[PDB]
Design a protein around this ligand. Structure first.
Ligand SMILES: [Cl-]
Ligand SMILES: [Fe+3]
Ligand SMILES: [Fe+3]
Ligand SMILES: [Mg+2]
Ligand SMILES: [Mg+2]
Lengths: 404, 404
């Protein structure tokens, strides 16, 4: 099965090229869901000069399909109630008494069946897919008990069977301490987090292990205990770090050659250099920054100077970032974090694939990788970062197949 | 013709009811594109108990159709180039040389035919309609010469013939001076603004007259000249005021019984009281605030205390607010301006209708008004303000007709 997509402008994001690796008057040759060639039509090899199908792209821009490397897409209910209460002047106490807080998401997720959870996640998933997203990372963390943490992962795996999308999962039991384990973080890790990890891995439901290293959650030493366990099983790790303060969560992840460190509002120069050295991707999440009215900006320039790679994600979750648009995420990255257009595009493609350890499989338009790309009805790549609340997607191709 | 919409929850936004005027187990009877009844299914008149068609809404929420009372939907090209340049550290001088700045939009709008401007606007219009918007205000202001200013208004009128939408226009020749009139605000008003207004009025192309009162634009005295001409031709007025400084534009608008005063970042207490006293709606535009990285927040509390009505709009334009989502606008009003959920829902329906002088015609679910409403797939109305980058629209009814 072969197919050609010619007469196009390519944003290959090939790291061997400058900028976004733009190629004019180009073509993409596909064979069995894989890219056989991506470059000038004049350089198209002879054995690939023909195919079963040929699509005239009319000179439109083609980029790698987008990747959302950080989301909590699976969960029950929503947190609109406390949103409204907060705006009405309610205190944290009044909200808590009304049932607000992360406990609301935990309760709502524990109460639903896999079937219902899939039903509630599909609308969120489809919104991302409609914007050219082909790969999405989904975390657990709203169960805080083995039974529910695992259910969340099964739901994620299930979603992948209902839509043309690539889904990778992260075990995040080390998200918060349940009421029944208050003041006993160690016991929670011993009784819930670790045995949960072994079970998830045995079930093949977890692609990575995540954690929340913060003053209000788990300490560096506590997360270290979780990473050690994951490392022994061959599972890559990642971490929510320096979101609300500088604890050293970033340096910890870097010491474990973590796939990424996420949020990083309070990351320092030392931590940035550590991430770059370890090759750990810095995942910035503008949605949470925006929704939480945060004032401390992540150290973009320090990350740039250290040579660290920056990725951007929606951090889609009901409590701090009920965001379902990766296009908007890039606009926020530029507007709020002052990232350049080149950085924003690379952040949701090449670096996003890297943050998920899938760069060899997808993320760029290079021969040998999966044929996952998005055709855009734009005149300039910048349009994807410039517009606010618009979708110029023309077509989405997943594994060589035009899906929508 | 007649029709019924039963088994639904209503957010009538009736000013006689508390909050957003919510009605449980309600129905909507429509006759000749008008609302015959809207309220409890039990209070339904036997006369309206029967209809040609009936629709079961499955208990879904229904609100008046949304209204975008402030946009510059019509224009040629886009400003993604300078967006990219600025992020790369380009100076204004460098951007100007690259052809950037408002001159880019004026040049493009003047160069494109009426037909092309219609086509370039359709995607923006459709994105708004996809969100349940049924009434949209479109301004001219990117022509800066009589022929182009009128062309923009004709384009706006023409759009109404291509889609199920109510479009109101605003003559905004007093937006800025073009290259040949810099330093000559008086002659510009004399040669273009006033004669253009006369011709626009003679052709029935303008529903209102707008202006930009600011240091970098026209003074109070200059705008007063334009408003006096508007008054003489029986046309209502509105004004872009206090966006970058406090010049007293709001106060002038109020003296002319302005339908609305928009932006208002620098509005003082005296100004807020003048608006409430005159009945002028305060139109806040979070898109421009966000995109321009503004630091001065409009006086929301002063507006609340003075009793002024607040509306929210996209201010969709290529230069300062390339925003095409009214749902996102509400989330920004809440997130950036700290407006309550009730204020945000009212800001895009009842108060928006008022800002356009259309309250007697639409904006609330009351008998005698146009049957324009949106059916949503939501649990609570707060969800429309809470989510970021999501569209829960189930169906759109325009003048009693299901269109989306
Ligand atoms: Cl074309
Ligand atoms: Fe997260
Ligand atoms: Fe405006
Ligand atoms: Mg095109
Ligand atoms: Mg008056």
């Amino acid at each position: 099965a072969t197919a050609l997509w010619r007469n196009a402008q390519l944003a290959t994001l090939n790291p061997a090229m400058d900028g976004i690796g733009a190629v004019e008057n180009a073509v993409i040759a596909v064979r069995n869901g894989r890219i056989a060639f991506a470059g000038p039509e004049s350089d198209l090899p002879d054995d690939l000069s023909t195919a079963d199908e040929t699509t005239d792209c009319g000179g439109r821009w083609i980029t790698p399909a987008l990747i959302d490397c950080h989301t909590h897409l699976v969960f029950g209910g929503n947190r609109a109630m406390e949103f409204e209460m907060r705006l009405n002047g309610a205190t944290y106490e009044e909200i808590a008494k009304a049932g607000g807080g992360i406990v609301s998401s935990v309760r709502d997720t524990r109460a639903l069946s896999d079937e219902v959870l899939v039903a509630q996640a599909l609308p969120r998933l489809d919104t991302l897919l409609s914007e050219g997203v082909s790969t999405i990372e989904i975390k657990s963390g709203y169960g805080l008990d083995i039974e529910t943490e695992l259910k969340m992962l099964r739901v994620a795996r299930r979603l992948e069977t209902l839509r043309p999308v690539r889904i990778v999962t992260s075990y995040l039991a080390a998200h918060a301490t349940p009421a029944d384990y208050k003041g006993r973080n160690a016991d929670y890790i011993t009784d819930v987090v670790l045995p949960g990890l072994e079970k998830a891995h045995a079930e093949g439901l977890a692609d990575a292990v995540d954690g929340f290293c913060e003053g209000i959650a788990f300490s560096v030493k506590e997360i270290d205990r979780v990473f050690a366990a994951a490392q022994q099983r061959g599972l890559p790790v990642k971490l929510h770090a320096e979101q609300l303060s500088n604890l050293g969560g970033a340096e910890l992840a870097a010491s474990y050659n973590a796939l990424s460190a996420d949020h990083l509002e309070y990351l320092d120069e030392t931590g940035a250099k550590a991430l770059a050295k370890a090759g750990t991707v810095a995942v910035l999440l503008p949605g949470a920054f925006y929704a939480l009215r945060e004032k401390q900006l992540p150290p973009v320039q320090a990350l740039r100077d250290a040579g660290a790679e920056i990725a951007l994600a929606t951090d889609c979750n009901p409590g701090t970032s009920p965001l379902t648009s990766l296009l908007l995420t890039m606009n926020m990255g530029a507007t709020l974090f002052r990232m350049t257009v080149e950085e924003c595009l690379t952040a949701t493609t090449r670096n996003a694939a890297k943050a998920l350890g899938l760069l060899a499989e997808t993320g760029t338009l290079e021969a040998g990788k999966s044929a996952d790309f998005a055709i855009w009805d734009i005149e300039r790549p910048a349009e994807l970062v410039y517009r606010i609340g618009f979708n110029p997607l023309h077509a989405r191709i997943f594994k060589g197949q035009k899906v929508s």
